[PDB]
Every structure is written in structure tokens, then in C-alpha cells.
């Protein structure tokens, strides 16, 4: 919900126009298995929900924001860098899972269209190219194992190459 893209609206309605035979055997079984064990499992789920009654709140995810970046903290010091290294690592763990959501958005694009797939969508493939390219050039993907000090050097390497290209052109 909300974060998931999902389909706009589901169609499909029963026609049953050609022939009689024995109607639709799948629809006849759909009404049969709805009361056979689908109704029994729904009654058992309702009985388990009623038996819960009192439940724990659980305050979900903790905040903890900013605490000064590694770029702001000039000169090497163990007391200052430690909290900056934790801040970068927490962002890197989130940025890994941001890609995974858009990855699952592309998974939804393949199924919910089926026949078209490549010809349609147009937004999910474009959003994937906007994030992955930003992830590849900024958040490691070339800077080996994760390090906060190496990321600042990687950001400076991209900035120096861009400034040399902009001044020439």
C-alpha cells in the first residue's frame, strides 16, 4: 500500500455465451471450493484474530538523524569520524533496498501487462535507469568493499572529472 505501485483496476466478467455443456467447470469448482476449505480457513483466521485481543504496540523503526557528515568533519580524528562512518553505512543499507523496491516495480511491470511488456510500461524502465545510474556512479559499485573515507575520495574523483569537462567545453 502507498509505496507499492500496483495495477489501476482489475477487469474480467463472466460471459458464458457459446454452448451449454455443463456451464463452466472452473466456476462450478470455484463456488464448491469456496465453502469446502476456503470458508473453513477464513473462519479459523477469524477465530485466531478474536483470540488475540490484547496486542503489543511496538514503536517501529528508530529515527537518529544527521549527526554531522564526514565531509563536514575536517582532519582525521577517531571521536568525530566514528559517528560519520555509522551515518554513511546506515544510508548505504537503505540505498541498497531502495533499488530492491524499484527492482520489484519492474517485476510487477512484466506480469501486470504480460503480452506487451517491452512496448508498454515506459515509466518503470525509465525510473530504473534514473536510480541505478545514480547508484553506480556515487554509491560505490566500483570502490570495492564499503568504506566512508573511500566514498569521499570517489565523490571528489567524479567532481574533478566533471569540472575539467565543463571548463573545456
Amino acid at each position: 500500500x502507498x509505496x507499492x505501485x500496483x495495477x489501476x483496476x482489475x477487469x474480467x466478467x463472466x460471459x458464458x455465451x457459446x454452448x451449454x455443456x455443463x456451464x463452466x467447470x472452473x466456476x462450478x469448482x470455484x463456488x464448491x471450493x469456496x465453502x469446502x476449505x476456503x470458508x473453513x480457513x477464513x473462519x479459523x483466521x477469524x477465530x485466531x484474530x478474536x483470540x488475540x485481543x490484547x496486542x503489543x504496540x511496538x514503536x517501529x523503526x528508530x529515527x537518529x538523524x544527521x549527526x554531522x557528515x564526514x565531509x563536514x568533519c575536517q582532519e582525521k580524528d577517531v571521536l568525530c569520524m566514528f559517528e560519520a562512518e555509522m551515518q554513511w553505512r546506515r544510508d548505504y543499507k537503505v540505498d541498497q533496498e531502495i533499488v530492491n523496491i524499484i527492482q520489484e516495480r519492474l517485476k510487477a511491470c512484466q506480469q501486470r501487462e504480460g503480452e506487451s511488456h517491452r512496448q508498454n510500461c515506459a515509466k518503470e524502465l525509465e525510473q530504473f535507469t534514473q536510480v541505478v545510474k545514480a547508484y553506480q556512479d556515487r554509491y560505490x559499485x566500483x570502490x570495492x568493499x564499503x568504506x566512508x573515507x573511500x566514498x569521499x575520495x570517489x565523490x571528489x574523483x567524479x567532481x574533478x572529472x566533471x569540472x575539467x569537462x565543463x571548463x573545456x567545453x
Binding site: 530504473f128 535507469t129 541505478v132 553506480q136 566500483x142
Partner: protein, 118 residues
């Protein structure tokens, strides 16, 4: 590997001096067999016997490293060519692949658009 036809009824002496030598083959065979037969058909044995032919077989491969190879001949240097040789062979394979890859990153981009790995 066998070169001509499969050797079984081909090239043999027609009952000459080889017949006396062929009879000697069964004499040594039965000599090792009879001592095996005596140490087999008793119920009070319980345990796998030695058999010195298989003990010396393991000793031929595991040991005999430095008692042998004391004349380090030109054949050992030919074996060394198959030793160090292949290790230096890939040095002109992996480096040529790397210099092909690294030059494609900097000038004339060949990097993948959807490469989040590594």
C-alpha cells in the same frame, strides 16, 4: 595405446623354450596363493590380512621422493617446462584482457547501464 590389431592370438612362439617359462609362472603364483589359502579358511582369524604387494604399492607412490630423482637430468628440466610454464602463460592472457577492459572504461565507454553488482 595399442597400435595394430588387439593383441590376444597374435605373435607367440610355437611351444619352444617359452613352455618351461610358462610353467614357472604357475609355480610362483601358487606359492603366494597357498600361503593366502592357509590364512583365510580358519574361523579364528578375524581381521584383514597384510598382503605385501599392496603395502609396497602404496610405498611406491607416497614415499621414494628423495632416494629417487638424485640424478636431475634434462628430462626433469623438460618436466619443469610443464611446471612453471603454464603459470607464466596466463600472465600474457589476463593482462591483455585487463588492458582491453581498463582502456574501454576511460575512453569510449563500454560499461553496462544496469550494473549494480560489485
Amino acid at each position: 595405446s595399442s597400435l595394430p590389431t588387439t593383441l590376444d592370438p597374435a605373435e607367440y612362439d610355437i611351444s619352444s623354450e617359452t613352455r618351461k617359462a610358462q610353467a614357472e609362472r604357475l609355480a610362483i603364483r601358487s606359492r603366494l596363493k597357498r600361503e593366502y589359502q592357509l590364512q583365510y579358511y580358519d574361523p579364528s582369524r578375524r581381521g584383514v590380512i597384510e598382503d605385501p604387494a599392496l603395502v609396497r604399492w602404496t610405498y611406491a607412490r607416497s614415499a621414494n621422493i628423495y632416494p629417487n630423482f638424485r640424478p636431475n637430468t634434462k628430462t626433469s628440466l623438460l618436466g619443469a617446462l610443464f611446471g612453471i610454464g603454464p603459470l607464466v602463460f596466463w600472465y600474457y592472457v589476463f593482462k591483455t584482457d585487463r588492458d582491453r577492459k581498463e582502456k574501454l572504461i576511460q575512453e569510449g565507454k563500454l560499461d553496462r547501464t544496469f550494473n549494480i553488482s560489485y
